Amino acid sequence: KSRHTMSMAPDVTREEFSLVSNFFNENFQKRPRQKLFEIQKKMFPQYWFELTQGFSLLFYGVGSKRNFLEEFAIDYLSPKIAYSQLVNSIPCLILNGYNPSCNYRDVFKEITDLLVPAELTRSETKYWGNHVILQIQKMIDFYKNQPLDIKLILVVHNLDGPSIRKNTFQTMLSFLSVIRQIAIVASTDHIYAPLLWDNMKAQNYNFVFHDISNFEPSTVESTFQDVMKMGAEGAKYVLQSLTVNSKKMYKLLIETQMQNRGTQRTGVELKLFNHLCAADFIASNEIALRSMLREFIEHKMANITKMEIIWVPYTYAELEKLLKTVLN
Amino acid sequence: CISLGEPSSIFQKIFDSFQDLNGPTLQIKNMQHLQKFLEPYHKKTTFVVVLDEMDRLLHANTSETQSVRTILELFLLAKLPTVSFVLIGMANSLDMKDRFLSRLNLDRGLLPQTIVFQPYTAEQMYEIVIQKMSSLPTIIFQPMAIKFAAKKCAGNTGDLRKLFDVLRGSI
Amino acid sequence: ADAQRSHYTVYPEKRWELYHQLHSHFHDQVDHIIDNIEADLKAEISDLLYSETTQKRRCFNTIFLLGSDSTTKIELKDESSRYNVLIELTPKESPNVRMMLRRSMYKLYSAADAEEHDVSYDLSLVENFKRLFGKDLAMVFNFKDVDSINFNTLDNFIILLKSAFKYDHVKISLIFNINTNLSNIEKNLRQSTIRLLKRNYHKLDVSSNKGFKYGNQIFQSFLDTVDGKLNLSDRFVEFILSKMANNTNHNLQLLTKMLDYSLMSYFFQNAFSVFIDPVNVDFLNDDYLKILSRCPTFMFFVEGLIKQHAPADEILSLLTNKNRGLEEFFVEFLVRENPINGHAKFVARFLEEELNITNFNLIELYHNLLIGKLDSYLDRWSACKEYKDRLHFEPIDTIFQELFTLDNRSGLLTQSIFPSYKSNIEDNLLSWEQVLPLSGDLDKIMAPVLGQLFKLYREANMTINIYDFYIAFRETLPKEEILNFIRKDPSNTKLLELAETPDAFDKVALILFMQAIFAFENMGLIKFQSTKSYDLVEKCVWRG
DNA sequence: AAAAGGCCTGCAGGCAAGTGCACAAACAATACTTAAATA
């Protein structure tokens, strides 16, 4: 069952990786991106007239919205529609949904002061008995008899974020979006977005959908997430900071384990390994040997199975690289 | 930075250098409040900050929640006056640089000069020993046996001063 | 740069006026019926809450809300000399019994304080209550959303409350907001506690959808709001009916939503809105005269003229050869009253009070009307046989209506309100050209990374290897173009030094792959099965 | 040519390799409460 394992892959340093991603994502399909963008910008007065009726504007379509999200919102919608009201441009409440440190409690503590503090509603602040939901209920009862104009524009990047998608946060944002004097516009990436809202939450949201596909590299979103590249190279820096005796003993280990990708058959037995590290007069006994070995083990820098095989799971290529570069 | 596990009371410890009294609770807590907190007052002699034993803040509570968060906050030097709090940090285990955000570390921060100080067998530490021991007692003993001790310890050792102490115990 | 911080805020037409003056009438009647139903619900619940003097007076009376949305606010009688404290419990507020008790006690004590102007959060507060507040107490519990609360906990809590009936200065009442299925509730509780609730219950219903007494009524009000001023094809009505039938709980809200959205589409693209009233016949333009030519009514009636009027001279003269005469020929049929709406209201109110029929839908009735199957509609009850000739209405084929109407033939609204969320993505990803138009060479000779990876994606089985796909994608990767494109940037130093790496092809392959599989996890297509392992993955979506 | 003693082979008798994984408990630090210092 010999499967292609990602171990047998040409690794790329973080610098080369970052820089080539930069080159590509900033030059791969520029002319397509700008053509698409200048074409779709004509839709902006359409969004104006749609949000005139407070229809929560949800945005789907492949590629990141974050850039385009802040682009449409901060630059076009807010100040133009502010001028259109008849003065601080309506504070654009951007929700870094990709940021997993967003919490309903604090963001609502912000929202409160953003919204009208016409009365000392802080007096209604109580025990953990959630005054988020009760106070927003009261705020809705208030706004039901208030004039109709946007007093704040909130926009969520990646409404399917690891925090906003929490059903509590979702319900809070639903009961929020019920308010008329606020404009709700957001976007997601999860293809299963409609799984989030029942007819109750839809009724709260009154979602109107729009596709936006511009095929972005998801710059910011690549930042919070992480994959195996984001071990062999882990130990590569460790061995760069050690003692000469450790250097020599690992040198002997790597010779006797690379002689026979560095496979397990190619290792050595601890019997003969002690025989060697005692012949060349390095190890006095087995206890000091295993001690000066566990410093590699206590950071998972070498493998051991059973013969008493100590086999370096690091590739033959990377191993002989250690030899030719950092060991010799 | 030992008994804190949090990035507030640290910077009061830098306010300790003013020999004054203020309300620090915020101005020592959030990065922006820190930037507000560090515009010099007396003569415009630049003040730079140093964090001794960050390997407790680095080794603090859960990584992706507070300690990596604290590192991101304190570590970003995006001030507008170039006379900023230039962190002079110290970490025991290298994994700290592996725990950093990949994007942030390569193009920004105090990270690049990841100077290493590998265990000095005799060549620098033994000479520090000799230079402090300029007033050398008459019969200390055979210096070659001294270097023998140095090597056969530093094999598994990083304290020649403590090997010197077991030598004073021997004498 | 800073964007990685958490939600850091930033602190930076005649057609339209008719939209206003009519859309606002629409919403006005909407909100009228809305407040009607709301006051109705408040009234019925406040009524049923009292006057039920049950001589037992040792068991709190229970009020079930069948089909309750759980959002229905409640009011109480002021009822001096006795506090009327409302208590609301959410399935979030209910981790156990003890914390339910404490949260409820704190809530009711705070309310007694607000009415009142050291206390144990427990049942003692009940009996001390009089001594500590004077007036006797009467609380009511409003379990906001019961179906999700763990019924063992709620049961234990009710048995707890039962003990409060040994003080006689308090009385309690329960308000169950069941989402539906009273059988579901009576399936979970201990039967011995049901027999405690069953002392005096009332299966009061709260459903916006019931006999359409609000549904059909708001539909009719909408018909009135659109009377004589536009039309709506059978396609529109059947689409409304369909999309309504699949949304059980809240038909009305969605109905208003779709109607308003259709109106917005019209008043933002239709140019003839200004021509439902004669006061803007002078609002005509020569280009408007041109666009009033391409009408389907226009061509149909030109054909009818050519057929019937054998002399082509009258038809030719009334044609583009004249413009004032032509526009008069057009405005001739502009005033078709369309009794369809009138006779619709007629038959509606008729079978509402003459036949007095309730379990019916005026929407599909109007559909049949525009069709003419209204006979095979009214037949459903066998009571209009004597009336199917006085409620008779053959559908009339009005003319020129193809300019003053609304129909979903372009599916703009349907695609924008009810999109194929996964199908749209699969299409625009695999196809990608209908949206995407120095370095243009590779874009023209090699697909965007997303779609050209999606297409290999497609042939993948349930469980796939990371690296097998990596190589099958390396096959797709043109190394010749990869060196064409990397060295195509000489201006950068480090990128140039990168460009001469001899093993750069597979390296950049892994780079692009580990960016693509990266950005295709938050998009939901692929799942990184067994994080900390990531040796294989699964393709969640399939085309289908 | 078929029906009755006898003997040969297709179905599976079976179960360890073995991974998934659905159970559990502290878990790391949430969210909030309550006494104190200053005007």
Structural tokens at position C152: 């063992």
Alpha helices by DSSP H, C270-361: 286-291, 296-308, 312-317, 324-331, 339-349
CA of residue B39 to C1' of nucleotide D9, angstroms: 96
Alpha-carbon span B30 to B32, nearest angstrom = 6
Report which residue type is found at B129: V
For chain C residues 501-540, those near strand D by a CB cutoff of 7 A are: 530
Report which residue type is found at C437: P
- Those residues with Cβ within 8 angstroms of residue C296's Cβ, 6 or more apart along the chain or in another chain: C402
CA A267 to chain centre: 39
B chain contacts of residue A243, beta-carbon cutoff 8 Å = 118-119, 121, 154-156
Alpha-carbon span A245 to A264, nearest angstrom = 25
Classify A286 as helix, strand or coil: helix
Structural tokens at position C73: 């606010």
Q: CB–CB of B102 and A243 under 8 A?
A: no
Note the strand D nucleotides within 7 A of protein beta carbons. 20, 28-33
Strand order in the sheet with C136-143: C82-89, C136-143, C170-176, C61-66, C203-205
The nearest CA of chain C is from the CA of B3 a distance in Å of 27
Classify C52 as helix, strand or coil: coil
A96 - beta bridge partners?
A157
Alpha-carbon span A282 to A308, nearest angstrom = 19
C-alpha Rg value of chain C to the nearest Å: 34
Alpha-carbon span A282 to A256, nearest angstrom = 15
Residue nearest to nucleotide D38 (CA to C1'): B23
The answer to whether the beta carbons of residues C200 and C63 sit under 8 Å apart is no
The answer to whether the beta carbons of residues C251 and C215 sit under 8 Å apart is yes
CA of residue A77 to C1' of nucleotide D9, angstroms: 83
CA of residue C526 to C1' of nucleotide D21, angstroms: 21
Phi/psi of residue C539, nearest 5 degrees: -95, 100
- Those residues with Cβ within 8 angstroms of residue B80's Cβ, 6 or more apart along the chain or in another chain: none
Domain boundaries, chain A: 29-230, 231-328
Alpha-carbon span C21 to A162, nearest angstrom = 44
Q: CB–CB of B156 and A14 under 8 A?
A: no
B chain contacts of residue C1, beta-carbon cutoff 8 Å = 78
Phi/psi of residue B163, nearest 5 degrees: -65, -35
* Strand D contact with B61 (CB < 7 A): yes
Strands A268-269 and A208-211: unpaired
Alpha-carbon span C172 to C85, nearest angstrom = 10
* C-alpha distance from residue C388 to each of C16, C234, C356, C393, C441 (Å): 42, 22, 15, 8, 71
Q: CB–CB of A28 and C511 under 8 A?
A: no
C-alpha Rg value of chain A to the nearest Å: 30
Of B69, B94, B102, the CB nearest to A241: B94
- Those residues with Cβ within 8 angstroms of residue C217's Cβ, 6 or more apart along the chain or in another chain: C33
Alpha-carbon span B99 to B68, nearest angstrom = 7
Q: CB–CB of A95 and C248 under 8 A?
A: no
CA C34 to chain centre: 16
User: Is the four-CA dihedral C29, C30, C33, C36 of positive or negative sign?
Assistant: negative
Alpha-carbon span C186 to C201, nearest angstrom = 13
CA A323 to chain centre: 37
Q: How many CB atoms lie within 10 A of CB C325?
A: 12
A chain contacts of residue B121, beta-carbon cutoff 8 Å = 243-244
Q: Is A292 on the interface with B (CB under 8 A)?
A: yes
Alpha-carbon span A106 to A114, nearest angstrom = 12
Q: Which of A6, A67, A70, A153 to mutate to test the interface with C (most CBs of C within 10 A)?
A: A6
Alpha-carbon span C360 to A178, nearest angstrom = 31
Alpha-carbon span C213 to A185, nearest angstrom = 35
Neighbouring chains of C at 3+ CB pairs under 8 Å are A, B
C chain contacts of residue A27, beta-carbon cutoff 8 Å = 439, 489
The answer to whether the beta carbons of residues C237 and C363 sit under 8 Å apart is yes
Alpha-carbon span C205 to C37, nearest angstrom = 13
CA of residue B11 to C1' of nucleotide D16, angstroms: 62
- Those residues with Cβ within 8 angstroms of residue A205's Cβ, 6 or more apart along the chain or in another chain: A56, A58, A174, A177, A184, A197
The answer to whether the beta carbons of residues A8 and A261 sit under 8 Å apart is yes
CA of residue A271 to C1' of nucleotide D16, angstroms: 32
Q: Which residues of C110-134 are buried (b: 16+ CB within 10 A; e: fewer)?
A: bbbeeeeeeeebeeebbbebeeebe
Phi/psi of residue A186, nearest 5 degrees: -150, 180
User: C540, exposed or middle or buried, with CB in 10 Å at 0-12, 13-18, 19+?
Assistant: exposed
Q: Any idea what the Cα angle at residue A104 is, between residues A102 and A110, rounded to 5°?
A: 90
Q: CB–CB of A237 and B94 under 8 A?
A: yes
B chain contacts of residue A241, beta-carbon cutoff 8 Å = 94, 116, 118
- Those residues with Cβ within 8 angstroms of residue C111's Cβ, 6 or more apart along the chain or in another chain: C83, C85, C86
Q: Is B78 on the interface with C (CB under 8 A)?
A: yes
In A109-262, which ranges are E strands? 152-157, 182-187, 208-211
Classify C262 as helix, strand or coil: helix
C173 - beta bridge partners?
C61, C140
The answer to whether the beta carbons of residues C364 and C431 sit under 8 Å apart is no
Q: Which of A237, A240, A277 to mutate to test the interface with B (most CBs of B within 10 A)?
A: A237
The answer to whether the beta carbons of residues C489 and C439 sit under 8 Å apart is no
- Those residues with Cβ within 8 angstroms of residue C234's Cβ, 6 or more apart along the chain or in another chain: C367, C370, C371
Phi/psi of residue C173, nearest 5 degrees: -150, 145
- Those residues with Cβ within 8 angstroms of residue C505's Cβ, 6 or more apart along the chain or in another chain: C474, C477, C479, C482, C483
Distance linking the first and last C-alpha atoms of chain C: 40
Q: CB–CB of A193 and C421 under 8 A?
A: yes
Stated as kind and residue range, the H or E segment containing A104 is helix A104-114
* Strand D contact with A130 (CB < 7 A): yes
Structural tokens at position C377: 């509609």
CA of residue B1 to C1' of nucleotide D36, angstroms: 27
Phi/psi of residue C127, nearest 5 degrees: -70, -40
Neighbouring chains of A at 3+ CB pairs under 8 Å are B, C
The residue whose two tokens read 């210096």 is B143
Question: Any idea which nucleotide's C1' is nearest the CA of A128?
Answer: D32
Stated as kind and residue range, the H or E segment containing A295 is helix A286-297
The answer to whether the beta carbons of residues A179 and A153 sit under 8 Å apart is no
The answer to whether the beta carbons of residues A154 and A56 sit under 8 Å apart is no
Neighbouring C-alpha atoms within 13 Å toward the C-beta of C243: 21
Q: How many CB atoms lie within 10 A of CB C446?
A: 16
Q: What's C85-149 look like in SS3? A: EEEEECCCCCCCHHHHHHHHHHHHHHHHHHCCCCCCCCCHHHHHHHHHHCCEEEEEEEECCCCCC
Alpha helices by DSSP H, chain B: 9-15, 31-37, 68-75, 95-99, 102-107, 125-132, 143-154, 160-170
* Strand D contact with A300 (CB < 7 A): no
The answer to whether the beta carbons of residues C524 and C541 sit under 8 Å apart is yes
CA A257 to chain centre: 39
Q: Is B60 on the interface with A (CB under 8 A)?
A: no
* Strand D contact with B62 (CB < 7 A): yes
Q: Is B107 on the interface with A (CB under 8 A)?
A: yes
Q: Any idea what the Cα angle at residue C64 is, between residues C59 and C70, rounded to 5°?
A: 130
Stated as kind and residue range, the H or E segment containing C258 is helix C251-269
**How many angstroms is the resolution?**
3.9
Q: What's C336-382 look like in SS3? A: CCCHHHHHHHHHHHHHHHHCCCCCCCHHHHHHHHHHCCCHHHHHHHC
Classify B22 as helix, strand or coil: coil
Classify C248 as helix, strand or coil: coil
User: Is the four-CA dihedral C185, C191, C193, C199 of positive or negative sign?
Assistant: positive
Q: Which of A116, A160, A122, A123 is nearest to A141 (CA)?
A: A116
Q: Which of C254, C253, C245, C252 is nearest to C215 (CA)?
A: C252
CA of residue C96 to C1' of nucleotide D24, angstroms: 19
Of A14, A241, A242, the CB nearest to B106: A14
* Strand D contact with B66 (CB < 7 A): yes
Return the DSSP state at A309. Answer: E
- Listed by the residue before each break, gaps in chain B with C–N over 2.5 Å are none
Structural tokens at position A2: 């010999």
In C149-191, which ranges are E strands? 170-176
The nearest CA of chain B is from the CA of C511 a distance in Å of 14
Interface of A with C in 103-132 (CB under 8 A): 107, 110, 114, 126-127, 129-130
Alpha-carbon span A129 to C103, nearest angstrom = 7
CA of residue A234 to C1' of nucleotide D26, angstroms: 30
The answer to whether the beta carbons of residues A96 and C6 sit under 8 Å apart is yes
DSSP per position, C452-516: HHHHHHHT--SEEEHHHHHHHHHHHS-HHHHHHHHTT--S-HHHHHHHT-TTHHHHHHHHHHHHH
Q: Which of C5, C6, C35 to mutate to test the interface with A (most CBs of A within 10 A)?
A: C6
The residue whose two tokens read 């619940």 is C45
Method: cryo-EM
User: B42, exposed or middle or buried, with CB in 10 Å at 0-12, 13-18, 19+?
Assistant: exposed
Alpha-carbon span C317 to A3, nearest angstrom = 82
Q: CB–CB of A243 and B118 under 8 A?
A: yes
Tally B–C CB contacts below 8 A: 5
Angle, in degrees to the nearest 10, between helices C251-269 and C234-245: 150
